[PDB]
């Protein structure tokens, strides 16, 4: 059975106006800004942007890739697909 989300989990993350996007749950570094309650730090592959999202917008990558893991015209998307498949836990700083 599923656990709660934890840092390192791979997802497609949904934001308004954008397709479901390859992403991961990030760690929060010591000294770094914490997310609001009930929110997770989401690092978006390809764009390398961070947003704070709740579970309603988080789709586990393995279950969802057949539906959401197809090339898309949007800036950063295809790079993001390579990242999540090939080095999802790397430093992208």
Swiss-Prot record:
Q: What does this protein do?
A: Acts as an epigenetic regulator of myogenesis in cooperation with DPF3a (isoform 2 of DPF3/BAF45C). Associates with the BAF complex via its interaction with DPF3a and HDGFL2-DPF3a activate myogenic genes by increasing chromatin accessibility through recruitment of SMARCA4/BRG1/BAF190A (ATPase subunit of the BAF complex) to myogenic gene promoters. Promotes the repair of DNA double-strand breaks (DSBs) through the homologous recombination pathway by facilitating the recruitment of the DNA endonuclease RBBP8 to the DSBs.
Q: Which organism is it from?
A: Homo sapiens (Human)
Q: Which family does it belong to?
A: Belongs to the HDGF family.
List the protein's name: Hepatoma-derived growth factor-related protein 2
Q: How does it assemble?
A: Interacts with HDGF. Interacts with trimethylated 'Lys-36' of histone H3 (H3K36me3). Interacts with trimethylated 'Lys-79' of histone H3 (H3K79me3), but has higher affinity for H3K36me3. Interacts with IWS1. Interacts with H2AX, POGZ, RBBP8 and CBX1. Interacts with histones H3K9me3, H3K27me3 and H3K36me2. Interacts with DPF3a (isoform 2 of DPF3/BAF45C). Interacts with SMARCA4/BRG1/BAF190A, SMARCC1/BAF155 and SMARCD1/BAF60A in a DPF3a-dependent manner.
Residue ranges of domain PWWP in the record: 7-64
| Compartments, record wording | Nucleus; Cytoplasm
- Span covered, complete protein: 1 to 93 of 671
Tissues in which the UniProt entry reports expression: Widely expressed. High expression is found in heart, skeletal muscle, ovary and testis. Overexpression is frequently observed in hepatocellular carcinoma samples.
């Amino acid at each position: 059975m599923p656990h709660a989300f934890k840092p390192g989990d791979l997802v497609f993350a949904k934001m308004k106006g954008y397709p479901h996007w390859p992403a991961r749950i990030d760690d929060i570094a010591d000294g770094a800004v914490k997310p609001p309650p009930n929110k997770y730090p989401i690092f978006f592959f390809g764009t390398h942007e961070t947003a704070f999202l709740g579970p309603k917008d988080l789709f586990p990558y393995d279950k969802s890739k057949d539906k959401y893991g197809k090339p898309n015209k949007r800036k950063g998307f295809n790079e993001g697909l390579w990242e999540i498949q090939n080095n999802p836990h790397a430093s992208y700083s």
